[PDB]
Amino acid sequence: KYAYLLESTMNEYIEQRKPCDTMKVGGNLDSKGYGIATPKGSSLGTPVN
Amino acid sequence: PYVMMKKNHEMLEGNERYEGYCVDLAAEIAKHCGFKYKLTIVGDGKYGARDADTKIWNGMVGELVYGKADIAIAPLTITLVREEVIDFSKPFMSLGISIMIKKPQKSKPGVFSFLDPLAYEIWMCIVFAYIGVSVVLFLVSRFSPYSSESTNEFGIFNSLWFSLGAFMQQGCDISPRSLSGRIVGGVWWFFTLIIISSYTANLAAFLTVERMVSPIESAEDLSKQTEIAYGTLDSGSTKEFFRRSKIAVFDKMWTYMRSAEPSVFVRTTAEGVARVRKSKGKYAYLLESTMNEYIEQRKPCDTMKVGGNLDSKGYGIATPKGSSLGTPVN
Amino acid sequence: RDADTKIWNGMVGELVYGKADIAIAPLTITLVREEVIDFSKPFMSLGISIMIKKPQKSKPGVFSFLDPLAYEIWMCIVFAYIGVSVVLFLVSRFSPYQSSESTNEFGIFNSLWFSLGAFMQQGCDISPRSLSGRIVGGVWWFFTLIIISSYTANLAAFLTVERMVSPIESAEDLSKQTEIAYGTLDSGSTKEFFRRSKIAVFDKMWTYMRSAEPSVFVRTTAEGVARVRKSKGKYAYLLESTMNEYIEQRKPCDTMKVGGNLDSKGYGIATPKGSSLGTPVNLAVLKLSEQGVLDKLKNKWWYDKGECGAKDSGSKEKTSALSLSNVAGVFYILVGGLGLAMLVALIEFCYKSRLFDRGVQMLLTTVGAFAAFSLMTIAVGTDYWLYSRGVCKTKSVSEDETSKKNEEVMTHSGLWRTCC
Amino acid sequence: AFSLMTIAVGTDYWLYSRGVCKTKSVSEDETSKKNEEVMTHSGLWRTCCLEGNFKGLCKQIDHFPEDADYEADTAEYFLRAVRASSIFPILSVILLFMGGLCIAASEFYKTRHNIILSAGIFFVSAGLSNIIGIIVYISANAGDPSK
Amino acid sequence: LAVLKLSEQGVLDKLKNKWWYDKGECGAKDSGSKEKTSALSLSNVAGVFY
Amino acid sequence: SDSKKNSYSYGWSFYFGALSFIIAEMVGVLAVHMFIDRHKQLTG
Ligand SMILES: NS(=O)(=O)c1cc2c(cc1Cl)N[C@H]([C@H]1C[C@H]3C=C[C@@H]1C3)NS2(=O)=O
Ligand SMILES: NS(=O)(=O)c1cc2c(cc1Cl)N[C@H]([C@H]1C[C@H]3C=C[C@@H]1C3)NS2(=O)=O
Ligand SMILES: N[C@@H](CCC(=O)O)C(=O)O
Domain remarks in the entry (chain B)? Predict the structure, then answer.
């Protein structure tokens, strides 16, 4: 009787853990991303990209 | 639907002749960053690749590297070799390489679909066997029976009804009592045991069939069958993907495309969709999924997206390397 | 080698006489080639193999309706049919302790008709109508419910199955017949193999091939494939397995490779003696084989460039309508049953229009009792029940191992004794 | 019934199939290509092309086909041998005729009283020979491939 | 040279055919159902006869 | 193989036991017909 809204990567992870009693339904409502973050002006920023 | 010619292209001028998704996106970007713009089309109509043995970019990437264009509001896939020459923005749609086939036109179950487990020549010989048994069972029974004929209850018309009861498995009141009567009744019982049971066993097969829902379920299915050609858009990012991939299934798919004649590669997306529609399902076109959704949801509705996306990519706004507005577009 | 001039020819000659540096080629690793040029570790494995013409799909028979049940059960159904009809007669006809005898309508001729009717799932006119009569009728109903539901479980499948029937399954099966013809190449290492054969099977194969008219040997491999395809399944050609798999994957797709490889040999990259290339060529073969490149290059050229496409084409499955050819045997029996029914009605009409005895039937019973007692004692005593492969007096007792009882033999078993 | 069977065994519009025409009846030259499987009214003995430039030409059917790819088992051999000689439609025609002689010898040679019974047997037996001719005909048309 | 000479004379074959196959302790019969539509056998329905 | 290697076949001793069945059933029918016929002569 309860549906929880959370990010999809966590949601797929809880589904693959015991007691296996969760399910991910529906497509993603928004779309966002996880990205590697470097400080401004770091020389690493171009090879990390 | 990224860039289209507006229906009133003759009536309008300037930017107003174009309309589409990128047309709306370019307006929203320039509204935020305050710059005036003019929408143009790339000349060769190619997205952009390097020339082999000449090392010269073509297309929309080629216009940005060589300074002829300032910014690309386009379905331009963020790939490795493009990033080294031009900066991309953050992705604005997510997609992947997907497959397009012709939809198999489904055969509707007709109004007389119950006659399908047995052919149309076998029902005709059932009726000929039904007539033939009911007359022989008449000739046997009403045969100077030695008052004489009044004993058996098998005329012709009762014999047609006894034989009809044996076939539809419902039984009847009368039953043959002479020895030659019990032969023709006994053989027709064996006939109707096989044929009715061959019907019900095959009808279980026709009802519980799933159907020919996909000859291609996934990308490995394309790799194993050579009856069906598959190609990509020439000088695009999708062709560059199969060349550069070290995955075992994708290497087999590049081995097929490179060698096979006639050339499975197409010039534009509109040409490649047509080769699906004109090959009786023997050409599967590997295109981006966001183009594949748009073709699938429009008339004449004879294209089908099979399998998952082969990977995950993205479209990006592109400026030249170290251009003045690269950071505001991010 | 030329036998007298002692110069090498071929690609081995090109490497010895310094013309070439490496023989990336299907060159068989042999002893006499090894002594004059080095060989790599073999990049591909092969052996002598059997090529037979691909047999056409076995259509189901005329009598394919009785295929869901084995011929064991059909004979036991007939025995159970006669068994019930006699018991149902015997039960319903005793002297009831003058119309008391004539109550039940079950003679021997009606009781055959009740039992036939219950089995064919058509209701019959008469009913047992007595307690011991209904137990026979009740149990035969439970018999026919189980058997018919077992028979008609998958009756449509047994009418529409085709199976490829190999005439030959291996080299020993080709050894024990002369109708299908052997063949090898006239001038090759394969014919050399059957000269130097201390295996009794292969030596039996060689005495046949030498003494055979017309000549089973062919001058080229191209003619040997054509003699397979011409002689309509009566010719089997022996050649190396890598060629044999290649001809199978080419149109008209009417060849088949049967049996395992009779010998095992290899193809290796050949370098001249003392070449510096010999050590990296050895190590490059080993790098390709671990990476699966040699598995990938073989799976490309032999099967993926294949004109045949046998894998995907045989993989798709369909279920289709019954044809008249599939159940034509049922119609042959029916019209055969109708012609029999007219023939019986004529001969009984001529007999009625144109001498049973109690003493004659008494002599008939005495002979038949003795005839039944004679056949049953001869059956139990004498041991010719089953003809199958079994343990015989080679190693009838398990005295020593490895001997395998001549690998098996035909053995007429019995109810107690087995005899070979 | 005597007329309809003699007409049926006589004419050759039994089956409409993509048959091997007269041009491909012999393998005469290269790339004749059977006019890409031209429609053909095959029959009980004669297979003849229609609606083509080479229509109106006929040949006997190869009931035993050729040097093809078969071991020739006995069930297919006996089925081909029956349909080749067409013994079941021919036995139908003779059985229809003998009933025609009995029904002719009914009014004439009357009071024999069993001729009209025997004519019933010839008419029933001719029908049973007729359906056994139809079944072997349809079961012999499996050589048409139908993939 | 020793391995190649033993291979061509079938010695490596004869020693393999000896050691791997002479034991034969169980005929494993691991083929099983190579063909799918098996005819129903008497041992499966022998209880009905009983 | 799929009922192919052993290829079991039944010899003449098996079929005699089958013919010993069918004769034993025909006699058992005829012996009952006598027991009916002996009581047709017993009663009349
Ligand atoms: N698949 S195949 O038969 O072409 C094949 C055959 C062979 C392969 C690898 C493959 Cl993929 N590697 C072996 C190698 C492993 C070591 C033993 C022999 C060489 C060195 N040679 S082989 O036994 O000749
Ligand atoms: N049949 S077997 O496995 O016993 C077997 C296997 C092989 C044999 C000989 C036998 Cl008997 N010889 C070959 C050898 C002959 C030449 C070809 C490859 C090496 C050099 N190696 S093999 O291919 O590994
Ligand atoms: N998004 C692709 C489209 C062309 C293709 O699929 O190859 C590109 O810009 O290169």
Answer: The M4 transmembrane segment mediates tetramerization and is required for cell surface expression.
| Residues whose CB falls within 8 Å of the CB of residue C133, separated by 6 or more in sequence, listed in order | C88, C91, C92, C104, C106
Contact between C47 and C243 (Cβ < 8 Å): no
SS3 C198: coil
Residues 6 or more apart from C254 whose CB is under 8 A from it? Answer: C53, C54, C229, D69
Angle at B242 between CA B240 and CA B243, to 5 degrees: 65
Six-digit token string for D36: 């890409």
Three-class DSSP category at B121: coil
First to last CA, chain C: 53
Distance CA F23, CA D113 (A): 44
CA dihedral C268, C273, C275, C276 (to 10 degrees): 80
**CA-nearest residue, atom 14 of ligand 2:** C265
With H, G, I as helix, E, B as strand and everything else as coil, classify residue A7. coil
C48, β-bridge pairs: C240
How far is the C-alpha of C183 from the C-alpha of C216, rounded, in Å?
5
- Give Cα separations from C258 to C46, C52, C162 (angstroms): 14, 7, 19
Q: Give the pairing of strands D15-18 and D39-42.
A: antiparallel
Strands B229-231, B283-288: pairing is parallel
Residue B262: cis peptide before it, omega within 30 degrees of 0: yes
DSSP classification of residue B74: S
Rounded CA-CA distance B288/B312 in Å is 10
Q: Where are the beta strands (DSSP E) in A1-49?
A: none
One-letter identity of residue D100: G
Find the angle CA(B239)-CA(B240)-CA(B244) to the nearest 5 degrees: 125
Cis? peptide before B300, omega within 30° of 0: yes
Resolution in A: 3.6
Which D residues, 90 through 119, put their C-beta within 8 Å of a C-beta on chain B? 117
Distance from CA of D111 to the nearest CA of C (A): 17
Most ligand 2 atoms within 8 A of CB, residue of E4, E6, E12 to mutate:
E12
Does the bond joining A19 to the residue before it have cis omega, within 30 degrees of 0?
A: yes
Taking the CB of residue E36, how many other CB atoms lie within 10 A of it?
9
Residue of C28, C29, C39, C44 best suited for mutating to test ligand 1, as the one with most atoms within 8 Å of CB: C44
CA angle at C110 for the pair C108 and C116, rounded to the nearest 5°: 105
Residues in Cβ contact with B18 at an 8 Å cutoff, skipping those fewer than 6 apart? B3, B4, B5, B6, B39
Residue B288 alpha carbon, nearest atom of ligand 3:
6
DSSP of B193-241, one letter per residue? HHHHHHHHHHHHHHHT------S--SHHHHHH--SSEEE-BTTSHHHHH
Beta-ladder partners of B118: C322
For the CA of B287, the closest atom of ligand 3 is 6
Q: Do chains E and F touch, with touching meaning 3 or more CB–CB pairs less than 8 Å apart? A: yes
CA nearest B251: which of C221, A17, C292, E20? C292
User: Could you tell me which residues come within 8 angstroms of residue E39 by beta carbon, excluding any fewer than 6 positions away?
Assistant: C67, C68, C69, C70, C158, F3
